[PDB]
Write a protein that binds this ligand. Structure first.
Ligand SMILES: O=C(O)Cc1cc(I)c(Oc2ccc(O)c(I)c2)c(I)c1
Ligand SMILES: O=C(O)Cc1cc(I)c(Oc2ccc(O)c(I)c2)c(I)c1
Ligand SMILES: C=CC(=O)c1ccc(CCCCCC)cc1
Ligand SMILES: C=CC(=O)c1ccc(CCCCCC)cc1
Lengths: 250, 245
């Protein structure tokens, strides 16, 4: 199995550092985290015939720490030379299209089977039900499943970073100008990623193929996020929408 | 570097591994032949046992039980123990090894456990099925074992350790058994350094799973008493009754 080249190790060091420099609570999150009160995000005893509405209370708790998560995704991308080479127009499109994907990933990787929750921003542990009633709905199930399936993969910072790099450089986003260039960047990240994986030596058959499918799951989650956001603008009042949160979809 | 298994330990590792493989339902992918228990079965509209769901479990309970016994008998160290000791050890690890085997077959995508490698069931089906909370304990164990990526050898060794529990009430060759367990832990410990898993504090956390399997085995004993009160005698296979006397 071909391992990463000197140049790729250089690239790997750039992404890993960029990710670690933007990944909250890089200093033990499962020790300083705080569990969201049980009473918050509790399944409705009545359940409206509509189809389940968004728990405005839980939603408030989620959006109160959403901005930092969004800005962090932007800082990560700006720490990558390749990204900084892209036009302003392209950068915005790529960020708005991978924002939720990368965040969902960051949360998924922080899945704790013992408490069966996700540590958002590495400080808030939420249950599958709390995140759902919080406004993500079925999306919560998608993210939780992802986290459960990623356990056996034991992804390190370099693999999560590279994963984020691949999600960031999506040349299939609508409106992109440097379609070709961006794809060259992605292929570079993918190549370095795969090579790094051979170096890591994971104990799981068809690791590479299975991981790529996860990129596909993130794409689905990101899309469902946009649709889920539409219901939020309908049920959730404006006062609960942070500055960057709304622009990420508008 | 960490110490790896010696030549003598490799042969022991070979024995236990082949013993487990010969008594386990895989070596051919259990996801290609497994079937899902009808959703309508084991539905939950303490708690009463779902007779129908129960019947489906005990219908394949004997095979699982007989395999654990076969596993132990394929181990020379076990055959050197008195009949009374063998009976004691088996009755004390049966559910332990069984739970372990079911846990390792956990499937995140379907969120179920493939019993005997042919019947997949949900947390609810197994709970109302008669295991109650024990079902949650087994599913929890299965979820925490994903990152461990245990191979047949590690599960086999794990079963060996559970088997050679010299603290079982009534045992006679307590020291001979203890000696056997350590030989497995040592070989297991060395094998672990060979594999080299990417899970921080792998060894410590795995050993802890052994303690969880201990609790699961105990909670099942008390759970079995509820079954002999709610479930009719017909649904109790002969070998199933004796094992958990
Ligand atoms: O875990 C991290 O670092 C990043 C992170 C932060 C948050 I707050 C988060 O939850 C969301 C996201 C969108 C949304 O509309 C709602 I309501 C909740 C997730 I998923 C991930
Ligand atoms: O999966 C395997 O190979 C072995 C296996 C087989 C069975 I059937 C099983 O379920 C049980 C066990 C005890 C009990 O009282 C009831 I009701 C159901 C489990 I957990 C594991
Ligand atoms: C959708 C993405 C954007 O347009 C976007 C969002 C946020 C930012 C960062 C602004 C500074 C925020 C304080 C750190 C830049 C661009
Ligand atoms: C509790 C364990 C036992 O005592 C035990 C259980 C089963 C067997 C196998 C008997 C063979 C009959 C066909 C399965 C032997 C011993």
């Amino acid at each position: 199995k071909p391992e990463p080249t000197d140049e790729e190790w250089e690239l790997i060091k750039t992404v890993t550092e960029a990710h670690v420099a933007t990944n909250a609570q890089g200093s033990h999150w499962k020790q300083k985290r705080k569990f969201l009160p049980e009473d918050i995000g509790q399944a409705p005893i009545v359940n409206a015939p509509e189809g389940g509405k968004v728990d405005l209370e839980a939603f408030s708790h989620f959006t109160k720490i959403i901005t930092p998560a969004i800005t962090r995704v932007v800082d990560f991308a700006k720490k990558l030379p390749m990204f900084c080479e892209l036009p302003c127009e392209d950068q915005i499109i790529l960020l708005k299209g991978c924002c939720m994907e990368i965040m969902s990933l960051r949360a998924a990787v922080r899945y704790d089977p013992e408490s069966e929750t996700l540590t958002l921003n590495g400080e808030m542990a939420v249950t599958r039900g709390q995140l759902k009633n919080g406004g993500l709905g079925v999306v919560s199930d998608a993210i939780f499943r992802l986290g459960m399936s990623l356990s056996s993969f034991n992804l390190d910072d370099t693999e999560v970073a590279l994963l984020q790099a691949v999600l960031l450089m999506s040349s299939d986003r609508p409106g992109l100008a440097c379609v070709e260039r961006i794809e060259k960047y992605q292929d570079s990240f993918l190549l370095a990623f795969e090579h790094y994986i051979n170096y890591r030596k994971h104990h799981v058959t068809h690791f590479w193929p299975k991981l790529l499918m996860k990129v596909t799951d993130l794409r689905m989650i990101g899309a469902c996020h946009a649709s889920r956001f539409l219901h939020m603008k309908v049920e959730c009042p404006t006062e609960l929408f942070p500055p960057l949160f709304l622009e990420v979809f508008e």
